[PDB]
Each structure stands twice: as structure tokens, then as C-alpha cells.
Amino acid sequence: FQPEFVESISNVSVAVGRDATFTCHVRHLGGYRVGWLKADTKAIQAIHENVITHNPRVTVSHLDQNTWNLHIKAVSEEDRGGYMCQLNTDPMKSQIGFLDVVIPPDFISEDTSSDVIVPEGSSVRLTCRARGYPEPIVTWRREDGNEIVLKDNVGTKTLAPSFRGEVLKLSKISRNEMGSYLCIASNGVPPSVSKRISLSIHFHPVIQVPNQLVGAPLGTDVQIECHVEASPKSINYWIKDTGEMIVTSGKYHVQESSQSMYETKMSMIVRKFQKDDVGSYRCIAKNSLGEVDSSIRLYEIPH
Amino acid sequence: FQPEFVESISNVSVAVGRDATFTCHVRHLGGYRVGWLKADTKAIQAIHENVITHNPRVTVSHLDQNTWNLHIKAVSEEDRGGYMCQLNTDPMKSQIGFLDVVIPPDFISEDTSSDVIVPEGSSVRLTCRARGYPEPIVTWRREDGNEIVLKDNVGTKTLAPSFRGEVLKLSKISRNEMGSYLCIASNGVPPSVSKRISLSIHFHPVIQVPNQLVGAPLGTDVQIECHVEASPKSINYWIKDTGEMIVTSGKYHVQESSQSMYETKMSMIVRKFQKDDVGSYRCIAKNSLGEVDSSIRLYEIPH
Ligand SMILES: *[C@@H]1O[C@H](CO[C@@H]2O[C@@H](C)[C@@H](O)[C@@H](O)[C@@H]2O)[C@@H](O[C@@H]2O[C@H](CO)[C@@H](O)[C@H](O)[C@H]2NC(C)=O)[C@H](O)[C@H]1NC(C)=O
Ligand SMILES: *[C@@H]1O[C@H](CO[C@@H]2O[C@@H](C)[C@@H](O)[C@@H](O)[C@@H]2O)[C@@H](O[C@@H]2O[C@H](CO)[C@@H](O)[C@H](O)[C@H]2NC(C)=O)[C@H](O)[C@H]1NC(C)=O
Numbered sequence: 001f002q003p004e005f006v007e008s009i010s011n012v013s014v015a016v017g018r019d020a021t022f023t024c025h026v027r028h029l030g031g032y033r034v035g036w037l038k039a040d041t042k043a044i045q046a047i048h049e050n051v052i053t054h055n056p057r058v059t060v061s062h063l064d065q066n067t068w069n070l071h072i073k074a075v076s077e078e079d080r081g082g083y084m085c086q087l088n089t090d091p092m093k094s095q096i097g098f099l100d101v102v103i104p105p106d107f108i109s110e111d112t113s114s115d116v117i118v119p120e121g122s123s124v125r126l127t128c129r130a131r132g133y134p135e136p137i138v139t140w141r142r143e144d145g146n147e148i149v150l151k152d153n154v155g156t157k158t159l160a161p162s163f164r165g166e167v168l169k170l171s172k173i174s175r176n177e178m179g180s181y182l183c184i185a186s187n188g189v190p191p192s193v194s195k196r197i198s199l200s201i202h203f204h205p206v207i208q209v210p211n212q213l214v215g216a217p218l219g220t221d222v223q224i225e226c227h228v229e230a231s232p233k234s235i236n237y238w239i240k241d242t243g244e245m246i247v248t249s250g251k252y253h254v255q256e257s258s259q260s261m262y263e264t265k266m267s268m269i270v271r272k273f274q275k276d277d278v279g280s281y282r283c284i285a286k287n288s289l290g291e292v293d294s295s296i297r298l299y300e301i302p303h
Numbered sequence: 304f305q306p307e308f309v310e311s312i313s314n315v316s317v318a319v320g321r322d323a324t325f326t327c328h329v330r331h332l333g334g335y336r337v338g339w340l341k342a343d344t345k346a347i348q349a350i351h352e353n354v355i356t357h358n359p360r361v362t363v364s365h366l367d368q369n370t371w372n373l374h375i376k377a378v379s380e381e382d383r384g385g386y387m388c389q390l391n392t393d394p395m396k397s398q399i400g401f402l403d404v405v406i407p408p409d410f411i412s413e414d415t416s417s418d419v420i421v422p423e424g425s426s427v428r429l430t431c432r433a434r435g436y437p438e439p440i441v442t443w444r445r446e447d448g449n450e451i452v453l454k455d456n457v458g459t460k461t462l463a464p465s466f467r468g469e470v471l472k473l474s475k476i477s478r479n480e481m482g483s484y485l486c487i488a489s490n491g492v493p494p495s496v497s498k499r500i501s502l503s504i505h506f507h508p509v510i511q512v513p514n515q516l517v518g519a520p521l522g523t524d525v526q527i528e529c530h531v532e533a534s535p536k537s538i539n540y541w542i543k544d545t546g547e548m549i550v551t552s553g554k555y556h557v558q559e560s561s562q563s564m565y566e567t568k569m570s571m572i573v574r575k576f577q578k579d580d581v582g583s584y585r586c587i588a589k590n591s592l593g594e595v596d597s598s599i600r601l602y603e604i605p606h
Contacts, residue, residue: 032357033355035347035355037340037345037347039345041394041395042340042342042345042387042389042397043389043391043394043395043397044338044340044347044350044389044391044395047347047350047355052336052338052350052391053391053393053395054335054391054392054393055393055394056393078394084345086345086346086347088346088347088355088356088357089357090356090357090358090359091344091346091358091381092344092346092347092356094345094346
């Protein structure tokens with residue numbers, strides 16, 4: 001008889017850092033040798049039990065004269081390609097097997113965006129690119145969970161919880177669209193990678209005052225309110241007409257309240273209105289771009 | 304240091320049955336191994352001093368750790384292709400060398416013509432084909448040394464001592480062009496091969512007689528002649544008027560003479576003319592296609 005094999009050896013996908021093995025199922029091996037060589041480089045890997053290549057990750061093993069294995073420990077991208085076991089018959093016979101090496105995603109830092117500070121109303125592009133095999137997919141999300149504004153043309157705009165694409169086009173920006181966005185790159189190979197990108201929209205603080213005139217009967221508690229719209233968030237406080245700051249005490253009670261990143265509802269209560277409390281009170285909002293005040297007049301409702 | 308080589312190994316043309324050798328000139332070999340494998344089949348030939356392929360014509364040798372040889376004994380067509388010596392470095396380095404195997408010419412007996420018998424006036428094709436590497440050339444010659452009639456169109460014909468081409472076109476044949484032709488196939492690789500091809504033109508024998516009447520004074524010698532044109536060559540003889548054959552004796556003298564394959568000049572002399580010799584004498588020419596005679600009358604010139 002002549003040495004022949006059965007069943008073949010089959011292709012293998014594995015991904016980096018992991019081990020891999022190719023196996024040939026021979027019969028009637030006799031006095032012939034089974035050798036391996038990398039198909040594309042034509043580099044002899046092994047013959048029988050001897051290892052020829054000085055690639056350390058490469059080993060051989062066998063339990064009988066029937067099944068012969070080639071092992072790659074923690075495969076790399078250079079290891080991918082063909083692996084041929086051959087019997088040294090004349091002419092020689094050979095099985096061929098292909099090692100497919102997938103790689104997890106990794107960002108192209110030169111292409112991924114940084115934190116941006118865009119002016120309200122303009123258009124912005126957010127970019128995330130990652131290399132990997134297979135081709136990674138980039139999906140964008142808002143970190144707080146809200147939807148992303150998706151516009152096209154100039155008269156059609158929808159909303160979506162996520163967007164797929166390496167470049168996220170946000171045109172005609174509004175105050176609402178500020179905040180952290182997330183791009184994640186997934187190729188189906190763990191681990192996927194993400195990056196947090198902070199879209200900033202900045203403006204002067206703006207104060208709206210419902211009721212700039214409040215009437216109090218002596219001895220009651222009256223609340224005056226200011227509504228601030230500022231970005232970045234403003235540091236706020238109330239101030240006496242003379243020029244003295246109000247902080248919460250037994251007489252006063254100051255509070256703030258944020259409906260969003262750029263909205264704040266500041267309120268002050270003055271307990272037990274007296275002839276001493278009559279006058280105007282200013283609410284002041286300051287951020288890095290500027291500061292603005294507004295004045296509320298408190299008057300007495302007589303007898 | 305790392306093992307490196309110098310000068311490379313160079314391509315080799317050799318031709319069948321002859322030996323061949325490839326050699327790699329390495330330096331700083333150290334503890335690495337030099338192996339050979341056939342490039343196209345990717346079949347491992349050898350590693351270091353061990354021979355892997357069971358092709359018996361393949362051997363290895365070395366005199367030092369500096370020059371390593373691979374030897375093919377009596378190469379065949381299957382041996383042609385690449386021969387790669389490689390060091391088992393990581394990654395491996397390799398020299399490549401190509402074995403060019405030329406083969407001497409050999410006739411394609413199915414295509415080469417046999418002896419032909421063509422009718423006078425028609426056209427004939429003579430064919431010789433031989434396989435070999437490089438492409439063999441076919442040259443035609445006449446075996447007797449004469450030139451070949453080379454015609455084209457129907458109103459232009461020249462002569463040449465030889466003709467190059469696998470097919471020799473002889474159009475509008477004439478009696479002269481009969482005889483052996485030689486085709487020889489030469490590829491520049493010994494030995495060239497030849498074949499003898501016999502172009503036959505056949506016809507009834509035809510006899511021309513200058514002087515069908517000859518006058519003899521008694522006692523003289525008179526010669527009568529017949530000119531025969533026959534193919535294949537005719538068997539000729541003279542015959543008495545009664546019906547008795549003449550052969551050379553003391554009284555008569557018969558001869559023949561061939562100016563070519565198809566021409567014969569037969570002559571008879573009758574010594575000492577006597578009143579007994581007066582009468583007619585017939586010359587007879589017979590070949591396979593037929594026989595023909597002609598009659599010469601011998602008369603006496605008186606007193
Ligand atoms: C292993 O897969 C190959 C497919 O070709 C490979 O595809 C990738 C894995 C990559 O490694 C490429 O470089 C390769 O080209 C299968 O090849 C087919 O095999 C059949 C049967 O032998 C043959 O008829 C087809 O023509 C082959 N197709 C190609 C494109 O070459 C091969 O069969 C697989 N091996 C096993 C054991 O299943
Ligand atoms: C040996 O010859 C090759 C020429 O290519 C071969 O040609 C025949 C001999 C046949 O074997 C074919 O199958 C081959 O393709 C030379 O190859 C050239 O090498 C130079 C320098 O390395 C390179 O720049 C050219 O591109 C090559 N040309 C081709 C067509 O591949 C080779 O260099 C010769 N070897 C030596 C040592 O001289």
C-alpha cells in the first residue's frame with residue numbers, strides 16, 4: 001500500500017492571541033514522513049517530529065502514525081494564510097488548510113474627534129474610525145439616552161436613538177443637541193471599543209423673570225423667581241438692593257433647579273415680610289462668557 | 304550575527320538525462336539549517352543533510368557551513384521549475400533558482416509522411432513534425448543533392464537547395480522532382496533526427512528511336528540504339544525478328560545506360576554484318592505498369 005489520507009484538515013478562524021491547530025488524518029503511513037510548511041511564504045515549518053522554523057509559537061505533536069497536528073500558540077496577523085501538510089511520497093501528496101485571523105477593533109486616534117465647542121445654529125461633523133478584521137461598524141448614541149437629530153436637505157429632519165456610520169453629521173445645531181455623544185466600534189470580535197465625545201454649545205446667560213413686581217402683605221412669605229438659560233452652567237446668587245448677597249438663613253431661603261444642562265430655575269423666599277424688606281432684589285447669573293442681572297421689585301400691600 | 308548569503312545561486316539549462324546542481328553561498332550559518340524544496344509543487348526536497356523526497360535522483364552535499372548543494376541526477380521534464388534553498392530563520396530567507404530542461408527533437412510519427420506515389424503533373428504535400436524544446440525547425444533537402452522546385456501563384460517558380468518548414472509543398476510535379484527527400488528536425492539539442500521520404504512518379508515506358516533504319520556494309524559493326532523513358536525503371540532486352548532474345552556474345556554486344564532514375568539508353572552492336580543478319584530487331588522495355596516495343600530495320604549496303 002501507499003500512504004493516503006482521509007477527511008482532510010479544514011479551515012480555521014481564531015482571532016489574535018488565541019491558539020490554533022491543524023490536523024491531517026493519514027492511513028498506512030509506513031516509513032514516510034509528514035511535514036508542514038507555510039503556504040504563502042513557502043517556509044518549511046516542520047517535518048515529522050522535528051521543528052524547522054524558529055518561530056517559537058509553532059509546535060508539532062502526534063499520538064500515533066495516523067493523526068499529525070501543527071500548533072500555533074497565540075496567533076498573530078503574520079500567521080494567517082495556508083498551512084500544508086505533505087507526505088514525502090514520489091510524487092508528494094498534500095492537504096492544505098487556511099488560518100483566518102480576525103482582529104478586534106482599535107480606534108484610529110488621528111481620525112477620531114476630540115471635544116468640540118460649536119456655535120449654536122451651525123453644522124458639525126463627528127468622526128470615529130477604527131481598524132479591524134472584519135470591517136468594524138461605528139454606531140453613535142447619546143450618553144444620556146435621548147435621540148439624535150437626523151436632518152437631510154434643509155426641510156426634512158427626524159429623530160433616532162442611534163446612527164450607524166463613521167461620521168455623524170449634525171446640521172443646524174440647537175441648544176438641545178449639546179451633551180456627550182458615544183461612538184462604539186464593533187466587528188463582532190471582543191472587545192468592542194467606545195469613546196465619549198462632548199459636543200458643547202455656549203452662549204451668554206439669559207434671564208427671564210415672570211412677575212418682576214410682587215406684592216406682599218406684611219408678615220407673609222413671598223417667593224420671587226428667575227429663569228436662567230446659560231451655557232456653560234452659570235454660578236447664580238441673589239443680592240440686596242444695597243449690595244449684599246442673600247444666602248439661605250432663618251429669614252431667606254435660596255434654591256436652584258436644573259431642567260437641563262443649560263436651564264436653571266433659581267428662586268428666593270423671604271419670610272415674614274416687613275417694612276424693612278421693601279425694595280428691589282437682583283438675581284445674578286455668571287458663567288465664563290459673561291454675567292447678567294435682572295431686578296424684581298417687592299412692595300407692600302397696605303393695611 | 305544572523306545567517307546571510309551572497310552571490311545567489313543562478314538559473315541552469317541542462318537537457319534531459321544530464322545531471323544538474325544548485326548551490327547557495329551562505330555566511331555565518333551558525334546553528335540554522337539550509338533546506339531545499341521544489342518551488343512549483345512546494346514539495347520539500349531536503350533539509351540540511353537529510354533527504355525528504357523519495358525522488359531517487361535528488362541528493363544533497365556540502366563541504367563546509369558555507370556552500371550547500373542540491374543535485375538532480377539525469378534530469379527529466381518533471382524536474383524543471385524552481386528550486387529554493389531557505390534558511391530556517393524567523394522570518395525565513397531564501398534564494399530561488401530555475402532548472403530549464405531542453406529536450407531533443409522527436410518525430411510525431413502520425414504526422415510524418417510515408418512514401419508517396421503521385422501522378423505526374425499534380426500537387427503533393429510532404430509533412431514532417433517533431434516535438435521538442437525549444438521549438439524544432441524542419442528543413443527539407445533532396446537526398447541526391449539537387450535543388451527543390453519552389454513554386455507560388457501559378458506563374459512564378461524558383462529553385463533552392465533546401466526548404467524550411469514542416470510542410471513541403473510541391474505543386475505541378477514533373478518527372479525530374481522524383482526521388483528521395485530528407486526532412487531533418489533540429490532544435491539545437493543533439494541529436495537531430497531525420498527521415499527519408501520517397502516521392503515516386505510512375506508512367507508507362509516510352510521508347511524513342513533515332514534512326515529506325517540503319518545501313519550496314521557486309522563485314523562491318525553496326526550499333527542500333529533505343530532511348531527508354533520509364534518509371535519505375537524498366538527491364539529491357541533486344542529480340543530477333545523470329546523471336547529469339549539477344550544477349551552479349553561474340554556476335555552481339557548489348558548495353559544499357561541510365562542518365563537518371565527514369566531514363567535508359569539501351570544499345571546493341573552486331574559485329575561483322577552478313578546476309579544472315581539482315582532484318583528487323585526489336586528493343587523491349589517492361590516495368591510494372593506495362594511493356595512496349597519498337598522495331599529497327601537493318602539492311603545491306605550492296606557491293
Ligand atoms: C478552505 O477554504 C477554501 C477557500 O479559498 C480560501 O478562502 C479563504 C479562506 C482564504 O484563505 C483564501 O486565500 C483562499 O482562496 C476552499 O477552497 C475551495 O475548495 C474547493 C474544493 O477543494 C474548490 O473546488 C474551490 O475551487 C476552492 N475555492 C477557492 C476560492 O479556492 C477550501 O475547500 C477550504 N478547505 C476545506 C478543507 O474545506
Ligand atoms: C532566473 O530567471 C528569472 C526569470 O524568470 C524565470 O524565467 C524562466 C527561467 C522561467 O523559469 C520562469 O518561470 C521564471 O519566471 C529571473 O527573474 C528576474 O529577476 C530579477 C531580479 O531578481 C527581477 O527584477 C525580475 O522581475 C525577474 N523576472 C521575472 C520574469 O520574474 C531571475 O533573476 C534569474 N535568477 C538569477 C539568479 O539570475
